[PDB]
């Protein structure tokens, strides 16, 4: 059989193969044929965590697997190869989910992105169009086939994740601006376009798509059909338009309907020519604005909706809200306009099913902590495992090792339940504290590791009578010891050497 001991393995060869590998094969050489026999051992590796020990020569002489038994987990946690008598906390146990469910509304139509991204004409910046999109399945991967732009520019989300989220309403605004005024279509911008023609809010959640259109909006004589506002009494509020045309007055005297002194027309026409520089060529801009989930959702991508399961630790995806938990029936009285339910920590715990108007309650799956009770490794290798604060009827668990319950190895205390210890009626002094009036110890010989109830002290009863006294007739001199700490170590710490070292840039950065 394979020999006992340790012998580390050293690499030779690494190659950039970069192909699928699923199966392998071993070749043999046959002389000529002639009979032959071969033997070989094959094992499968798994993702594990090991604790390896290096001796003074630099060679690996020992290793401990961290998922074989509670003692090895304790050794890995303590980062030591020896464990002293006591009770330690090693890890936690959780229940893994079984399957996944997805619930999306009854949406069949396709969103009309074709009629927005090219219509042979775009409205002026001072009076920009606006189209509302709702009740359709949104496919944002086809937008690239309609306009010759380079890339998106999204602020609240990412362009590649737009096929998963499910919104309430979508809005599309389209116009034509100058080349160097594209940078003004952004939150917190100031300029002629920003505060007089088109203003974006400071908390924008959407995308901007701008592309050059010099081959359609330019004429040799000069395009004069695109106008913009120049004068205005006050700045614009977010998402507001102005259409009114009048004679702006820059003087005290009234204009009286004539563009005379201190009287102008606040509608200047762009001059577009094909011989202009890049910064002056016309640019077509379309802004998509998303509304987050507050009302029933109406717009989102093509995700299939699966079956609904209950009373199982399962993964859920309700209208882009993803999580894991146990879904049960609800006694909550949701109002017609409500769709979610929140708790003290501000996390969702009651949801409404998009397809059938029904309310479900979410509870996190069972979990808890594990403690390992062991005597010193110098004594024995046996341990007991205490699941803390769990009715011992619950016990795909997170820990790799699994426990098997026999008749008498499982005990239930007021601090959880204990696996691997035998209960006795005797009462000794406490050895390894466990919980409320329970202790554990190691027997001479799960038969080992007994768990009992601690004993307060030896029983006594002094005879009392109202005409009797007890007087001593001898003495004893005793000498006892008492140990008290007085002082501790005096240390000093240097900042610059500890934080930066001999570096000069780090010290300059730290100086401020």
């Amino acid at each position, epitope marked *: 059989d394979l020999p006992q001991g340790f012998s580390a393995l050293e690499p030779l060869v690494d190659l950039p193969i970069g192909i699928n590998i699923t199966r392998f094969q071993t070749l043999l050489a046959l002389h000529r044929w002639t009979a032959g026999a071969a033997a070989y051992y094959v094992g499968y590796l798994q993702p594990r965590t090991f604790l390896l020990k290096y001796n003074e020569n630099g060679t690996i002489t020992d290793a401990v697997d961290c998922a074989l038994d509670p003692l090895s987990e304790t050794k890995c946690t303590l980062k030591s190869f020896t464990v002293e008598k006591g009770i330690y906390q090693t890890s936690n146990f959780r229940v893994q989910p079984t399957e996944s469910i997805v619930r999306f509304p009854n949406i069949t139509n396709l969103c009309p992105f074709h009629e927005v991204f090219n219509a042979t004409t775009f409205a002026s910046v001072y009076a920009w169009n606006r189209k509302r999109i709702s009740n359709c399945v949104a496919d944002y991967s086809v937008i690239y086939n309609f306009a010759p732009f380079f890339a998106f520019k999204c602020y609240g989300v990412s362009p590649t994740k737009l096929n998963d989220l499910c919104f309430t309403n979508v809005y599309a605004d389209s116009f034509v601006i100058r080349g160097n005024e594209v940078s003004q279509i952004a939150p917190g911008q100031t300029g002629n376009i920003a505060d007089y023609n088109y203003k974006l809010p400071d908390d924008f959640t959407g995308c901007v798509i701008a592309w050059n259109s010099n081959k359609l909006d330019s004429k040799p004589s000069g395009n004069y059909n695109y106008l913009y506002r120049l004068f205005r009494k006050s700045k614009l509020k977010p998402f507001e338009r102005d259409i009114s045309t009048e004679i702006y007055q820059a003087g005290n005297k009234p204009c009286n309907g004539v563009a005379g002194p201190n009287c102008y027309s606040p509608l200047q026409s762009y001059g577009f020519r094909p011989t202009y520089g890049v910064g002056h060529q016309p640019y077509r801009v379309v802004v998509l604005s998303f509304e987050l989930l507050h009302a029933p959702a109406t717009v989102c991508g093509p995700k299939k909706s699966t079956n609904l399961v209950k009373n199982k630790c399962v993964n859920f995806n309700f209208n882009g809200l993803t999580g894991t938990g146990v879904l049960t029936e609800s006694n909550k009285k949701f109002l017609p306009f409500q769709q979610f339910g929140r708790d003290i920590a501000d996390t969702t715990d009651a949801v409404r099913d998009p397809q059938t108007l029904e309310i479900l309650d979410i509870t996190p799956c069972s979990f808890g902590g594990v403690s390992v009770i062991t005597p010193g490794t110098n004594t024995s*290798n046996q341990v007991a495992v205490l699941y803390q604060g769990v009715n011992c009827t619950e016990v795909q668990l997170t820990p790799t090792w699994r426990v098997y319950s026999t008749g008498s*190895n499982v005990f239930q205390t007021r601090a959880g339940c204990l696996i*691997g210890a035998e209960y006795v009626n005797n009462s000794y002094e406490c050895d390894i504290p466990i919980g409320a009036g329970i202790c554990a110890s190691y027997q001479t010989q799960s*038969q080992s590791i007994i768990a009992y109830t601690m004993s307060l002290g030896a029983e006594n009863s002094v005879a009392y009578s109202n005409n009797s006294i007890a007087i001593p007739t001898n003495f004893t001199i005793s000498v006892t010891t008492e140990i008290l700490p007085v002082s501790m170590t005096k240390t000093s710490v240097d900042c610059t050497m500890y934080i930066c070292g001999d570096s000069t840039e780090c010290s300059n950065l730290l100086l401020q």
Partner: nanobody
Amino acid sequence: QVQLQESGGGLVQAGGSLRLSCAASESIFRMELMEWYHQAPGKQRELVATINRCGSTNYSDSVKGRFIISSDNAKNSVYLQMNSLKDEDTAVYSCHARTWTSYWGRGTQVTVSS
């Protein structure tokens, strides 16, 4: 779910042979120990045979030269080959295995007629 189950007990005349087949539900390559105990009525249990992970095998005084203990790797099981039965071998037999916590079998009755 139960760790170990034994089967093979019954009525056998003196001088015969029998086979006990304590089968485990976990890979026996990490159990580190398989032990056989026998309890006869009126007395306590006494050690019979012991096999450890490495391969060393041990028996008590009333075992050597009579019956042996082995194990195969095709099926998780430990076999005891009772031979040369006599009167006091009538007992209930249990198998025990400890990896980090002792697991005990149910036990089976073995009776020899003399």
